[PDB]
C-alpha cells in the first residue's frame, strides 16, 4: 500500500528503491482491472507467481510519460532508458505500469554516456555543450541536465503521466524471507513422501543428517547438481 496507494511517486532520475523482506507477498491484491495495464514479466509466468519464494525483493517506483513505457523493457534504448533508468538483459521481475492521467517530475536528458543498469545519477553538474568549458549555472552552451516533465492534462495518451512500479525479485537460491501464502504442514520423516520446501518440489525419503551448514547456506547439492540437503523452514 505504500508503493501503490502512495499517491506520490519518485522522479525517474531519482527512482527510490524499497526493500521488501520478512513478510508474505500475496500478489492477488494487485489484480485490479483498471490499473496494471501492462504486466510484462521476464523469466516468471504471471500466473505462477503466488506459489514461489523470493529472497531479494526490491520495489522501485517512478512516474514517466506513457509513451516512454516501452523503453523500460530490457534491451530498449531511449532518453529514459539511456540517461534515467537502465535494466539488465538478464532481468527477472515484473514491470507493472498503469495510467494515472487523472491523478514537477524531473527527468535527466543530458549525460556524458549511458548509465549501467540499476544506477542512480542524481547530480546537478552543468552539462557543457561547446568548446568553452563553462562552469556557470547557465550559459549559451551550458545547459542544466534536469527539467520538469510538465504533464499536459489535456493530452490523451502522448505525453501523459504514467506511474511505473518494477518488482525485481531474485529467484530462490538462498535463505528466503518473502514467499506467497501457503499452509504449512508437519514434516514426515523416513517415508517416501512428496514435499514442497520453499518452492522446491520433489519426492524422497526425508531423513536427518550430520552435515554441517553455514548461515549463508540453505541447500546442498550433489555431483549431479540436484537438491540433496535442505534445511526446512521453522
Amino acid at each position, epitope marked *: 500500500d505504500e508503493v501503490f496507494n502512495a499517491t506520490r511517486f519518485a522522479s525517474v532520475y531519482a527512482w527510490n528503491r524499497k526493500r521488501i523482506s520478512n513478510c508474505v507477498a500475496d500478489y492477488s491484491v494487485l489484480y485490479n482491472l483498471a490499473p496494471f495495464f501492462t504486466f510484462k514479466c521476464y523469466g516468471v509466468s504471471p500466473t505462477k507467481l503466488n506459489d514461489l519464494c523470493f529472497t531479494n525483493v526490491y520495489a522501485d517506483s517512478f512516474v514517466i510519460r506513457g509513451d516512454e513505457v516501452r523503453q523500460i523493457a530490457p534491451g530498449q534504448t531511449g532518453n529514459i532508458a539511456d540517461y534515467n533508468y537502465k535494466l539488465p538483459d538478464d532481468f527477472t521481475g515484473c514491470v507493472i505500469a498503469w495510467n494515472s492521467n487523472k491523478l514537477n517530475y524531473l527527468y535527466r*536528458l*543530458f549525460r556524458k554516456s549511458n548509465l549501467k543498469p540499476f544506477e542512480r545519477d542524481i547530480s546537478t553538474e552543468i*552539462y557543457q*555543450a*561547446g*568548446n*568553452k568549458p563553462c562552469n*556557470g*549555472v*547557465a*550559459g*549559451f*552552451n*551550458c*545547459y*542544466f541536465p534536469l527539467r520538469s516533465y510538465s504533464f499536459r492534462p489535456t493530452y490523451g495518451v502522448g505525453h501523459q503521466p504514467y506511474r511505473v512500479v518494477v518488482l525485481s525479485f531474485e529467484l530462490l537460491h538462498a535463505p528466503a524471507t518473502v514467499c506467497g501464502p501457503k499452509k504449512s504442514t508437519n514434516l514426515v520423516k523416513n517415508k517416501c513422501v512428496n514435499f514442497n520446501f520453499n518452492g522446491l518440489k520433489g519426492t524422497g525419503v526425508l531423513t536427518e543428517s550430520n552435515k554441517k551448514f553455514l548461515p549463508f547456506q540453505q541447500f546442498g547439492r550433489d555431483i549431479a547438481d540436484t537438491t540433496d540437503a535442505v534445511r526446512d523452514p521453522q
Partner: antibody
Amino acid sequence: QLLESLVQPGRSLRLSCAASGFTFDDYAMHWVRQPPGKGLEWVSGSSWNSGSVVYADSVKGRFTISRDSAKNSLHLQMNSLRVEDTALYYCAKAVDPTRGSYSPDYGFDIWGQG
Amino acid sequence: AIRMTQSPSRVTITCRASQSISSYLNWYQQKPGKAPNLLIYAASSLESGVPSRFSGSGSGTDFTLTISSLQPEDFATYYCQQSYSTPLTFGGGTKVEI
C-alpha cells in the same frame, strides 16, 4: 513565426521581433545584419538559460539586446546608426538545445520572416 | 577570432578556417526572396525535411559541401558559418552559377 518590425547618423530606433508558434525562453534568439549586396553577419545574441549576452565584437557598447517573456520579443535598441550600417535585419531562433554535443545556441535557424 | 574564405567562387564548396574548428560548422542556403534555411549541422548531418542530395563532409580545417547532379531550383546562395567561439562569423559566400 518570427515576425519583426534612418539616414541620419544619430538615431534611436527600436527593433522588435515578435514570436509566434514556438515557445519563448527555450532557445537563443539572435539578430543578424545583412547589408544589401553582401553576406550575413551575426551582430547580437541572447540567452534563454541566463542573462548573459554577447554582441558582435566589431564594435562594442553600441549593440544592446533585451528579453521579454510576456510579449515574446527582443526589442533591440540601436543608437547612432551609421550610414553604411543600414541593412535589412534578421531575427533568428537557435536550434533545440536537446541536441547537445556541438553548440546548439550558436547555430542559427528559421531566420525570421521578411 | 575566426575568419573564413570559401575557396570556390557535383558542386563542391569548401570553406577554410585558420584554426582547428574540428566539426563546428553549419551550411546555410539563402533563397533570394526568402530567409536562409538550414542544410548541414555539426558539419556533417541533415536537418529534418532537407533533401538527401545535400551532403557535408570534412573536419578540422577542411570541409566540403557536395550537392550531386546539380538539382534544379537550387540557385540560392550557400554560406559557411562556425560555432567554435564568439563572435559568430559567416563565410565569404558563394552561389552556384549555371
